[PDB]
Protein backbone atom coordinates (compact mmCIF):
# COMPACT_ATOMS: atom_id res chain seq x y z
CA UNK A 1 0.00 0.00 0.00
CA UNK A 2 2.56 2.43 -1.40
CA UNK A 3 4.49 3.00 1.82
CA UNK A 4 7.79 2.10 0.17
CA UNK A 5 7.45 3.82 -3.18
CA UNK A 6 10.69 5.69 -2.60
CA UNK A 7 12.45 2.70 -1.13
CA UNK A 8 14.62 0.37 -3.15
CA UNK A 9 13.73 -2.99 -4.62
CA UNK A 10 16.34 -4.73 -2.50
CA UNK A 11 14.78 -3.17 0.59
CA UNK A 12 11.07 -3.07 -0.26
CA UNK A 13 10.94 -6.87 -0.06
CA UNK A 14 11.57 -6.53 3.68
CA UNK A 15 8.32 -4.66 4.45
CA UNK A 16 6.43 -6.71 1.85
CA UNK A 17 6.06 -9.51 4.43
CA UNK A 18 2.93 -7.69 5.54
CA UNK A 19 0.37 -8.86 3.02
CA UNK A 20 1.42 -6.29 0.47
CA UNK A 21 0.71 -4.05 3.48
CA UNK A 22 -2.62 -5.96 3.75
CA UNK A 23 -3.53 -4.91 0.23
CA UNK A 24 -6.66 -6.95 -0.49
CA UNK A 25 -7.78 -6.70 3.14
CA UNK A 26 -8.56 -3.04 2.54
CA UNK A 27 -11.09 -4.11 -0.09
CA UNK A 28 -13.02 -6.58 2.04
CA UNK A 29 -13.13 -4.11 4.93
CA UNK A 30 -14.41 -1.66 2.32
CA UNK A 31 -17.02 -3.80 0.59
CA UNK A 32 -18.38 -4.95 3.92
CA UNK A 33 -19.25 -1.28 4.37
CA UNK A 34 -19.68 -0.41 0.73
CA UNK A 35 -22.49 -2.96 0.99
CA UNK A 36 -24.12 -0.94 3.68
CA UNK A 37 -27.69 -1.50 2.48
CA UNK A 38 -28.78 2.12 2.96
CA UNK A 39 -28.83 1.93 -0.83
CA UNK A 40 -31.52 -0.70 -0.25
CA UNK A 41 -33.06 1.39 2.56
CA UNK A 42 -33.87 3.93 -0.16
CA UNK A 43 -33.78 2.08 -3.49
CA UNK A 44 -31.55 5.17 -4.02
CA UNK A 45 -34.97 7.00 -3.85
CA UNK A 46 -34.59 7.56 -7.65
CA UNK A 47 -31.93 6.95 -10.26
CA UNK A 48 -29.44 9.71 -9.54
CA UNK A 49 -26.24 11.03 -11.08
CA UNK A 50 -24.18 9.52 -8.27
CA UNK A 51 -25.72 6.06 -8.55
CA UNK A 52 -24.93 6.05 -12.24
CA UNK A 53 -21.35 6.80 -11.28
CA UNK A 54 -21.26 4.31 -8.41
CA UNK A 55 -22.42 1.61 -10.80
CA UNK A 56 -19.59 2.49 -13.15
CA UNK A 57 -17.33 2.56 -10.09
CA UNK A 58 -18.12 -0.89 -8.74
CA UNK A 59 -17.57 -2.55 -12.13
CA UNK A 60 -13.97 -1.35 -12.31
CA UNK A 61 -13.57 -2.56 -8.76
CA UNK A 62 -14.76 -5.93 -10.03
CA UNK A 63 -12.90 -6.16 -13.34
CA UNK A 64 -9.46 -4.89 -12.42
CA UNK A 65 -9.43 -7.16 -9.40
CA UNK A 66 -10.08 -10.14 -11.65
CA UNK A 67 -7.39 -9.29 -14.18
CA UNK A 68 -4.83 -9.51 -11.40
CA UNK A 69 -6.14 -12.76 -9.98
CA UNK A 70 -6.47 -14.44 -13.36
CA UNK A 71 -2.91 -13.62 -14.36
CA UNK A 72 -1.72 -14.90 -11.02
CA UNK A 73 -4.08 -17.82 -11.51
CA UNK A 74 -2.68 -18.79 -14.88
CA UNK A 75 0.97 -18.42 -13.89
CA UNK A 76 0.97 -21.31 -11.43
CA UNK A 77 1.18 -18.64 -8.76
CA UNK A 78 -2.37 -18.46 -7.48
CA UNK A 79 -2.74 -16.56 -4.22
CA UNK A 80 0.95 -16.45 -3.28
CA UNK A 81 3.03 -13.28 -3.14
CA UNK A 82 6.60 -14.20 -4.08
CA UNK A 83 6.81 -17.19 -6.39
CA UNK A 84 9.59 -18.28 -8.66
CA UNK A 85 9.16 -19.65 -12.16
CA UNK A 86 11.10 -21.74 -14.67
CA UNK A 87 11.61 -18.99 -17.23
CA UNK A 88 15.25 -18.00 -17.81
CA UNK A 89 15.85 -14.28 -17.80
CA UNK A 90 17.14 -13.02 -21.12
CA UNK A 91 19.85 -10.39 -20.90
CA UNK A 92 18.46 -8.69 -24.01
CA UNK A 93 15.55 -7.50 -21.88
CA UNK A 94 17.85 -5.66 -19.50
CA UNK A 95 21.64 -5.48 -19.54
CA UNK A 96 21.64 -3.99 -16.05
CA UNK A 97 23.71 -6.04 -13.63
CA UNK A 98 22.47 -7.70 -10.47
CA UNK A 99 22.86 -5.20 -7.63
CA UNK A 100 21.79 -2.19 -9.67
CA UNK A 101 18.32 -3.65 -10.09
CA UNK A 102 17.95 -4.48 -6.40
CA UNK A 103 20.10 -2.29 -4.22
CA UNK A 104 20.29 0.79 -6.39
CA UNK A 105 16.87 1.40 -8.04
CA UNK A 106 13.26 2.44 -7.36
CA UNK A 107 10.18 0.59 -8.63
CA UNK A 108 8.42 3.03 -10.95
CA UNK A 109 11.60 3.74 -12.86
CA UNK A 110 12.01 0.00 -13.29
CA UNK A 111 8.51 -0.10 -14.80
CA UNK A 112 9.58 2.24 -17.58
CA UNK A 113 12.66 0.07 -18.11
CA UNK A 114 10.66 -2.97 -19.20
CA UNK A 115 7.22 -1.60 -20.02
CA UNK A 116 8.17 -2.26 -23.62
CA UNK A 117 9.22 -5.83 -22.91
CA UNK A 118 6.48 -6.64 -20.37
CA UNK A 119 4.01 -8.28 -22.73
CA UNK A 120 6.61 -10.70 -24.12
CA UNK A 121 7.29 -11.90 -20.59
CA UNK A 122 3.59 -12.65 -20.10
CA UNK A 123 3.44 -15.12 -22.97
CA UNK A 124 6.87 -16.50 -22.10
CA UNK A 125 5.64 -17.66 -18.70
CA UNK A 126 2.47 -19.45 -19.73
CA UNK A 127 3.44 -21.22 -22.95
CA UNK A 128 6.90 -21.91 -21.52
CA UNK A 129 5.93 -23.17 -18.07
CA UNK A 130 2.29 -23.38 -17.12
CA UNK A 131 1.00 -24.71 -20.36
CA UNK A 132 4.07 -26.91 -20.45
CA UNK A 133 4.28 -28.41 -16.96
CA UNK A 134 0.70 -29.62 -16.95
CA UNK A 135 1.32 -31.97 -19.85
CA UNK A 136 4.55 -33.21 -18.29
CA UNK A 137 2.75 -33.68 -15.00
CA UNK A 138 0.03 -35.68 -16.75
CA UNK A 139 2.70 -37.87 -18.33
CA UNK A 140 3.99 -38.58 -14.83
CA UNK A 141 0.54 -39.85 -13.90
CA UNK A 142 0.31 -42.12 -16.96
CA UNK A 143 2.46 -44.72 -15.20
CA UNK B 1 4.52 0.82 -41.72
CA UNK B 2 4.80 -2.36 -39.66
CA UNK B 3 4.30 -6.14 -39.94
CA UNK B 4 5.79 -9.58 -39.32
CA UNK B 5 4.30 -13.06 -39.45
CA UNK B 6 2.99 -15.28 -36.69
CA UNK B 7 5.29 -16.28 -33.86
CA UNK B 8 3.54 -18.24 -31.11
CA UNK B 9 -0.16 -18.84 -31.83
CA UNK B 10 -3.37 -17.00 -32.54
CA UNK B 11 -6.71 -16.61 -30.87
CA UNK B 12 -8.78 -19.77 -31.50
CA UNK B 13 -5.84 -20.91 -33.62
CA UNK B 14 -6.02 -24.55 -32.60
CA UNK B 15 -9.77 -24.87 -33.24
CA UNK B 16 -9.30 -26.99 -36.33
CA UNK B 17 -6.42 -28.96 -34.91
CA UNK B 18 -6.42 -32.23 -33.02
CA UNK B 19 -6.64 -32.55 -29.26
CA UNK B 20 -2.98 -33.51 -28.91
CA UNK B 21 -2.01 -30.31 -30.72
CA UNK B 22 -4.59 -28.07 -29.06
CA UNK B 23 -3.71 -29.21 -25.54
CA UNK B 24 -0.52 -27.13 -25.65
CA UNK B 25 -2.46 -24.04 -26.72
CA UNK B 26 -4.98 -23.36 -23.95
CA UNK B 27 -3.50 -20.18 -22.53
CA UNK B 28 -4.39 -17.92 -25.46
CA UNK B 29 -8.03 -18.85 -25.11
CA UNK B 30 -7.55 -18.46 -21.35
CA UNK B 31 -6.13 -14.93 -21.28
CA UNK B 32 -8.43 -13.01 -23.59
CA UNK B 33 -11.67 -14.40 -22.20
CA UNK B 34 -12.06 -11.46 -19.82
CA UNK B 35 -10.34 -8.32 -21.09
CA UNK B 36 -11.15 -7.74 -24.75
CA UNK B 37 -25.41 4.32 -24.76
CA UNK B 38 -25.65 2.00 -21.76
CA UNK B 39 -25.33 -1.11 -23.92
CA UNK B 40 -21.60 -1.47 -23.43
CA UNK B 41 -22.16 -1.77 -19.67
CA UNK B 42 -24.74 -4.54 -20.11
CA UNK B 43 -22.05 -6.39 -22.01
CA UNK B 44 -19.40 -5.67 -19.37
CA UNK B 45 -21.35 -7.60 -16.74
CA UNK B 46 -22.36 -10.63 -18.82
CA UNK B 47 -18.69 -11.08 -19.70
CA UNK B 48 -17.99 -11.08 -15.98
CA UNK B 49 -20.96 -13.24 -15.00
CA UNK B 50 -19.91 -15.89 -17.48
CA UNK B 51 -16.34 -15.86 -16.23
CA UNK B 52 -17.24 -16.42 -12.60
CA UNK B 53 -19.39 -19.46 -13.41
CA UNK B 54 -16.60 -21.24 -15.23
CA UNK B 55 -14.25 -20.17 -12.47
CA UNK B 56 -16.67 -21.40 -9.81
CA UNK B 57 -17.14 -24.86 -11.30
CA UNK B 58 -13.39 -25.39 -11.34
CA UNK B 59 -13.33 -24.30 -7.72
CA UNK B 60 -15.80 -26.93 -6.56
CA UNK B 61 -13.98 -29.73 -8.34
CA UNK B 62 -10.72 -29.32 -6.43
CA UNK B 63 -9.28 -27.96 -9.65
CA UNK B 64 -9.03 -24.19 -9.24
CA UNK B 65 -5.98 -22.38 -10.55
CA UNK B 66 -4.82 -25.32 -12.63
CA UNK B 67 -5.49 -25.33 -16.34
CA UNK B 68 -5.81 -29.11 -16.48
CA UNK B 69 -6.19 -31.65 -13.68
CA UNK B 70 -7.41 -35.17 -13.20
CA UNK B 71 -9.99 -36.67 -10.89
CA UNK B 72 -10.80 -40.21 -9.81
CA UNK B 73 -14.21 -40.29 -11.51
CA UNK B 74 -14.18 -43.27 -13.89
CA UNK B 75 -14.92 -42.72 -17.53
CA UNK B 76 -17.98 -44.70 -18.55
CA UNK B 77 -17.73 -46.41 -21.94
CA UNK B 78 -21.48 -45.96 -22.35
CA UNK B 79 -20.73 -42.28 -22.90
CA UNK B 80 -18.35 -42.86 -25.82
CA UNK B 81 -18.06 -45.65 -28.37
CA UNK B 82 -15.00 -43.85 -29.76
CA UNK B 83 -11.67 -45.58 -29.52
CA UNK B 84 -8.90 -44.00 -27.51
CA UNK B 85 -6.37 -43.02 -30.15
CA UNK B 86 -9.10 -41.71 -32.44
CA UNK B 87 -9.96 -39.18 -29.74
CA UNK B 88 -6.46 -37.95 -29.01
CA UNK B 89 -5.30 -37.89 -32.62
CA UNK B 90 -8.19 -37.46 -35.03
CA UNK B 91 -11.11 -35.59 -33.49
CA UNK B 92 -11.19 -31.84 -33.05
CA UNK B 93 -12.72 -30.20 -30.01
CA UNK B 94 -15.57 -28.45 -31.84
CA UNK B 95 -16.80 -31.82 -33.07
CA UNK B 96 -16.19 -33.37 -29.67
CA UNK B 97 -18.55 -31.01 -27.84
CA UNK B 98 -21.43 -31.98 -30.05
CA UNK B 99 -20.93 -35.63 -29.17
CA UNK B 100 -20.94 -35.42 -25.39
CA UNK B 101 -23.41 -32.54 -25.19
CA UNK B 102 -26.21 -34.67 -23.77
CA UNK B 103 -24.12 -36.33 -21.08
CA UNK B 104 -22.67 -33.09 -19.70
CA UNK B 105 -25.10 -32.65 -16.82
CA UNK B 106 -24.47 -36.22 -15.66
CA UNK B 107 -20.76 -35.48 -15.71
CA UNK B 108 -20.80 -32.38 -13.55
CA UNK B 109 -22.97 -33.93 -10.86
CA UNK B 110 -20.74 -37.00 -10.94
CA UNK B 111 -17.66 -34.94 -10.21
CA UNK B 112 -18.69 -32.93 -7.16
CA UNK B 113 -21.02 -35.14 -5.19
CA UNK B 114 -19.19 -38.21 -6.41
CA UNK B 115 -15.65 -37.36 -5.48
CA UNK B 116 -14.70 -33.87 -4.35
CA UNK B 117 -17.51 -33.77 -1.85
CA UNK B 118 -16.43 -37.24 -0.76
CA UNK B 119 -12.76 -36.24 -0.75
CA UNK B 120 -13.39 -33.87 2.14
CA UNK B 121 -15.28 -36.00 4.65
CA UNK B 122 -12.60 -38.58 3.99
CA UNK B 123 -10.02 -35.81 4.18
CA UNK B 124 -11.17 -34.18 7.42
CA UNK B 125 -11.27 -37.53 9.22
CA UNK B 126 -7.69 -38.52 8.45
CA UNK B 127 -6.76 -36.64 11.61
CA UNK B 128 -6.82 -37.86 15.29
CA UNK B 129 -3.50 -39.70 14.94
Amino acid at each position, epitope marked *: FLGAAGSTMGAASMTLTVQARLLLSGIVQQQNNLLRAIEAQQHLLQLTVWGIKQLQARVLAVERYLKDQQLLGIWGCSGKLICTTAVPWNTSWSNKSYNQIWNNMTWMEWEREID*N*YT*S*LI*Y*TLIEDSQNQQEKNEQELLELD | *A*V*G*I*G*A*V*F*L*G*FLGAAGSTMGAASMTLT*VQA*R*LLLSGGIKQLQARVLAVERYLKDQQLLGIWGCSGKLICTTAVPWNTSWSNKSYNQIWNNMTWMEWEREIDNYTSLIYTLIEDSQNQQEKNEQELLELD
Partner: antibody, heavy 134, light 109 residues
Framework: VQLVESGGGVVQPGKSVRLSCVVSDFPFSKYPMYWVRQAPGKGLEWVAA????????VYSNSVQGRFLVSRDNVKNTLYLEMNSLKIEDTAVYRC????????????????????????????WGQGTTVTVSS | IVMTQTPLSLSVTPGQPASISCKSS???????????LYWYRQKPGQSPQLLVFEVSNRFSGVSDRFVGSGSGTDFTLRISRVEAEDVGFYYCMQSKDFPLTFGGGTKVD
Protein backbone atom coordinates in the same frame (compact mmCIF):
# COMPACT_ATOMS: atom_id res chain seq x y z
CA VAL C 1 26.93 13.07 -36.95
CA GLN C 2 29.32 11.99 -39.68
CA LEU C 3 27.57 9.92 -42.33
CA VAL C 4 29.20 8.91 -45.62
CA GLU C 5 29.45 5.88 -47.89
CA SER C 6 32.03 3.96 -49.92
CA GLY C 7 32.38 1.46 -52.74
CA GLY C 8 30.71 3.64 -55.36
CA GLY C 9 31.70 3.92 -58.98
CA VAL C 10 30.63 2.49 -62.34
CA VAL C 11 30.02 -1.08 -63.51
CA GLN C 12 28.39 -3.07 -66.32
CA PRO C 13 24.96 -4.70 -66.52
CA GLY C 14 24.74 -8.09 -64.85
CA LYS C 15 27.37 -7.12 -62.27
CA SER C 16 27.23 -6.90 -58.48
CA VAL C 17 28.82 -4.50 -55.99
CA ARG C 18 28.21 -3.66 -52.33
CA LEU C 19 28.43 -0.20 -50.81
CA SER C 20 29.44 0.59 -47.23
CA CYS C 21 27.81 3.34 -45.16
CA VAL C 22 29.49 4.00 -41.81
CA VAL C 23 27.95 5.98 -38.95
CA SER C 24 29.88 7.85 -36.29
CA ASP C 25 28.56 8.34 -32.83
CA PHE C 26 24.90 7.50 -32.03
CA PRO C 27 24.03 3.98 -30.78
CA PHE C 28 23.56 2.17 -34.04
CA SER C 29 21.65 -0.88 -32.80
CA LYS C 30 18.96 1.44 -31.46
CA TYR C 31 18.03 2.89 -34.80
CA PRO C 32 16.70 1.58 -38.10
CA MET C 33 18.14 2.76 -41.40
CA TYR C 34 16.98 3.33 -44.98
CA TRP C 35 18.11 3.68 -48.56
CA VAL C 36 16.95 6.32 -51.02
CA ARG C 37 17.63 6.85 -54.70
CA GLN C 38 17.54 10.28 -56.33
CA ALA C 39 17.65 9.98 -60.07
CA PRO C 40 19.49 12.83 -61.86
CA GLY C 41 16.90 15.44 -62.66
CA LYS C 42 14.09 13.43 -61.05
CA GLY C 43 12.57 13.29 -57.59
CA LEU C 44 13.35 10.61 -55.03
CA GLU C 45 12.67 6.90 -54.89
CA TRP C 46 12.61 4.91 -51.69
CA VAL C 47 14.72 1.74 -51.87
CA ALA C 48 14.97 -0.28 -48.66
CA ALA C 49 14.81 -0.36 -44.86
CA UNK C 50 16.22 -2.50 -42.04
CA UNK C 51 14.97 -2.92 -38.49
CA UNK C 52 17.16 -1.95 -35.58
CA UNK C 53 17.79 -5.57 -34.64
CA UNK C 54 18.39 -6.35 -38.35
CA UNK C 55 15.38 -8.67 -38.42
CA UNK C 56 12.88 -6.80 -40.61
CA UNK C 57 13.72 -5.93 -44.22
CA VAL C 58 11.34 -4.22 -46.67
CA TYR C 59 12.29 -3.64 -50.30
CA SER C 60 10.84 -1.57 -53.09
CA ASN C 61 8.88 -3.47 -55.72
CA SER C 62 11.09 -2.48 -58.65
CA VAL C 63 14.32 -3.60 -56.99
CA GLN C 64 12.60 -6.51 -55.24
CA GLY C 65 14.77 -9.60 -54.87
CA ARG C 66 17.77 -8.09 -56.66
CA PHE C 67 19.43 -6.02 -53.94
CA LEU C 68 20.63 -6.93 -50.45
CA VAL C 69 20.97 -4.97 -47.22
CA SER C 70 22.43 -5.89 -43.84
CA ARG C 71 23.71 -4.42 -40.59
CA ASP C 72 26.61 -4.89 -38.21
CA ASN C 73 25.79 -3.12 -34.96
CA VAL C 74 29.22 -3.89 -33.50
CA LYS C 75 31.16 -2.49 -36.44
CA ASN C 76 28.54 0.28 -36.97
CA THR C 77 28.41 -0.41 -40.71
CA LEU C 78 25.61 -0.43 -43.26
CA TYR C 79 25.70 -2.41 -46.49
CA LEU C 80 23.72 -2.20 -49.72
CA GLU C 81 24.64 -5.11 -51.95
CA MET C 82 23.09 -5.24 -55.40
CA ASN C 83 22.62 -7.86 -58.11
CA SER C 84 21.34 -8.01 -61.71
CA LEU C 85 22.18 -4.41 -62.47
CA LYS C 86 20.34 -2.40 -65.10
CA ILE C 87 21.16 0.92 -66.74
CA GLU C 88 18.19 2.73 -65.15
CA ASP C 89 19.68 1.99 -61.70
CA THR C 90 22.23 4.72 -62.45
CA ALA C 91 21.45 7.40 -59.85
CA VAL C 92 22.63 8.74 -56.49
CA TYR C 93 22.32 6.40 -53.52
CA ARG C 94 22.06 7.91 -50.06
CA CYS C 95 22.41 6.38 -46.60
CA UNK C 96 19.87 7.79 -44.19
CA UNK C 97 18.93 7.54 -40.51
CA UNK C 98 15.43 7.53 -39.06
CA UNK C 99 14.42 10.80 -37.43
CA UNK C 100 12.79 9.36 -34.34
CA UNK C 101 14.09 6.58 -32.19
CA UNK C 102 12.48 3.17 -32.54
CA UNK C 103 11.60 0.70 -29.85
CA UNK C 104 11.83 -3.06 -29.61
CA UNK C 105 9.15 -5.08 -31.44
CA UNK C 106 5.73 -4.92 -29.90
CA UNK C 107 3.91 -8.33 -29.88
CA UNK C 108 0.20 -7.54 -29.89
CA UNK C 109 -1.59 -9.85 -27.47
CA UNK C 110 -4.44 -11.00 -29.66
CA UNK C 111 -2.24 -12.53 -32.36
CA UNK C 112 1.30 -13.73 -31.80
CA UNK C 113 2.86 -11.32 -34.27
CA UNK C 114 5.48 -8.66 -33.56
CA UNK C 115 5.52 -5.14 -34.97
CA UNK C 116 8.48 -3.00 -36.04
CA UNK C 117 7.62 0.68 -36.27
CA UNK C 118 8.99 2.66 -39.21
CA UNK C 119 9.11 6.42 -39.58
CA UNK C 120 11.01 8.79 -41.81
CA UNK C 121 14.38 10.36 -42.10
CA UNK C 122 16.53 13.29 -40.96
CA UNK C 123 20.23 12.66 -41.62
CA TRP C 124 21.07 11.96 -45.25
CA GLY C 125 24.55 10.80 -46.05
CA GLN C 126 26.10 12.59 -48.99
CA GLY C 127 26.32 9.25 -50.71
CA THR C 128 28.12 7.57 -53.58
CA THR C 129 26.95 7.03 -57.16
CA VAL C 130 26.76 3.85 -59.24
CA THR C 131 26.55 3.95 -63.05
CA VAL C 132 25.55 0.95 -65.17
CA SER C 133 26.68 1.19 -68.79
CA SER C 134 29.14 -0.20 -71.35
CA ILE D 1 -0.42 4.94 -52.42
CA VAL D 2 -0.12 8.08 -54.55
CA MET D 3 0.81 11.56 -53.35
CA THR D 4 1.69 14.38 -55.74
CA GLN D 5 1.83 18.13 -55.23
CA THR D 6 1.58 21.59 -56.84
CA PRO D 7 2.82 24.09 -58.16
CA LEU D 8 6.09 22.89 -59.66
CA SER D 9 7.71 26.29 -60.28
CA LEU D 10 7.49 29.38 -58.06
CA SER D 11 10.20 31.76 -59.29
CA VAL D 12 9.99 34.53 -56.71
CA THR D 13 11.93 37.34 -55.00
CA PRO D 14 12.23 37.89 -51.23
CA GLY D 15 9.71 39.88 -49.22
CA GLN D 16 6.34 38.12 -49.69
CA PRO D 17 4.49 35.15 -48.16
CA ALA D 18 3.36 32.12 -50.14
CA SER D 19 2.56 28.46 -49.59
CA ILE D 20 3.15 25.02 -51.11
CA SER D 21 0.55 22.28 -50.76
CA CYS D 22 0.88 18.52 -51.28
CA LYS D 23 -2.24 16.58 -52.22
CA SER D 24 -2.95 13.11 -50.87
CA SER D 25 -4.84 10.24 -52.45
CA UNK D 26 -4.88 7.94 -49.44
CA UNK D 27 -5.71 9.77 -46.24
CA UNK D 28 -3.00 9.76 -43.57
CA UNK D 29 -3.75 9.32 -39.90
CA UNK D 30 -1.85 6.56 -38.17
CA UNK D 31 -3.26 4.88 -35.08
CA UNK D 32 -0.62 6.52 -32.87
CA UNK D 33 -2.56 9.76 -33.15
CA UNK D 34 -0.49 11.54 -35.79
CA UNK D 35 -0.28 12.10 -39.54
CA UNK D 36 3.04 10.91 -40.94
CA LEU D 37 3.81 13.60 -43.52
CA TYR D 38 7.38 14.90 -43.55
CA TRP D 39 8.29 18.15 -45.36
CA TYR D 40 11.91 18.89 -46.18
CA ARG D 41 14.24 20.64 -48.58
CA GLN D 42 17.31 19.95 -50.63
CA LYS D 43 19.66 22.45 -52.13
CA PRO D 44 21.03 21.83 -55.64
CA GLY D 45 24.01 19.51 -55.50
CA GLN D 46 23.31 18.63 -51.86
CA SER D 47 21.78 15.87 -49.81
CA PRO D 48 18.57 17.29 -48.31
CA GLN D 49 17.93 18.70 -44.86
CA LEU D 50 14.88 18.36 -42.66
CA LEU D 51 12.60 21.39 -42.56
CA VAL D 52 9.79 20.12 -40.33
CA PHE D 53 9.24 16.53 -39.38
CA GLU D 54 5.58 16.59 -38.50
CA VAL D 55 3.14 19.01 -40.04
CA SER D 56 2.92 20.54 -36.55
CA ASN D 57 6.43 20.51 -35.07
CA ARG D 58 9.69 21.81 -36.51
CA PHE D 59 13.37 20.90 -36.48
CA SER D 60 16.50 22.53 -35.05
CA GLY D 61 17.90 25.41 -37.09
CA VAL D 62 14.58 26.50 -38.57
CA SER D 63 13.15 30.00 -38.90
CA ASP D 64 9.78 30.63 -37.28
CA ARG D 65 8.10 31.60 -40.58
CA PHE D 66 7.78 27.94 -41.69
CA VAL D 67 4.24 26.84 -40.85
CA GLY D 68 2.36 23.76 -41.97
CA SER D 69 -1.13 22.36 -41.56
CA GLY D 70 -3.67 20.13 -43.22
CA SER D 71 -6.46 17.58 -42.90
CA GLY D 72 -6.08 13.84 -43.51
CA THR D 73 -6.07 14.47 -47.28
CA ASP D 74 -5.37 18.18 -47.68
CA PHE D 75 -1.84 19.12 -46.69
CA THR D 76 -0.28 22.56 -46.81
CA LEU D 77 3.12 24.07 -46.05
CA ARG D 78 3.13 27.86 -45.77
CA ILE D 79 6.22 30.07 -45.88
CA SER D 80 5.62 33.55 -44.50
CA ARG D 81 7.79 36.34 -45.99
CA VAL D 82 9.71 34.03 -48.30
CA GLU D 83 13.43 34.31 -47.55
CA ALA D 84 16.18 34.95 -50.11
CA GLU D 85 17.88 31.55 -49.64
CA ASP D 86 14.71 29.55 -50.40
CA VAL D 87 16.12 28.14 -53.62
CA GLY D 88 16.21 24.53 -54.73
CA PHE D 89 13.39 22.06 -54.25
CA TYR D 90 10.75 21.16 -51.69
CA TYR D 91 9.73 17.52 -51.41
CA CYS D 92 6.64 16.31 -49.59
CA MET D 93 7.35 12.91 -48.04
CA GLN D 94 4.76 10.66 -46.43
CA SER D 95 5.29 7.76 -44.05
CA LYS D 96 2.05 5.80 -44.06
CA ASP D 97 3.23 2.45 -45.41
CA PHE D 98 5.37 0.84 -47.90
CA PRO D 99 6.54 1.79 -50.42
CA LEU D 100 6.55 5.29 -48.98
CA THR D 101 6.67 7.73 -51.87
CA PHE D 102 7.43 11.41 -52.44
CA GLY D 103 6.36 14.38 -54.46
CA GLY D 104 8.14 15.74 -57.49
CA GLY D 105 9.82 18.55 -55.59
CA THR D 106 8.58 22.10 -56.14
CA LYS D 107 11.27 24.32 -57.62
CA VAL D 108 11.49 27.80 -56.10
CA ASP D 109 13.57 30.49 -57.79
Amino acid sequence: VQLVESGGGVVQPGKSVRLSCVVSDFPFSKYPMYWVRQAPGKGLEWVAAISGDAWHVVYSNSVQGRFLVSRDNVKNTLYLEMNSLKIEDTAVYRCARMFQESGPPRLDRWSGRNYYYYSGMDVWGQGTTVTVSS
Amino acid sequence: IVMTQTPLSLSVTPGQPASISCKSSESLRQSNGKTSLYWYRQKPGQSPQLLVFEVSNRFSGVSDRFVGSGSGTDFTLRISRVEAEDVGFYYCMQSKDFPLTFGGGTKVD
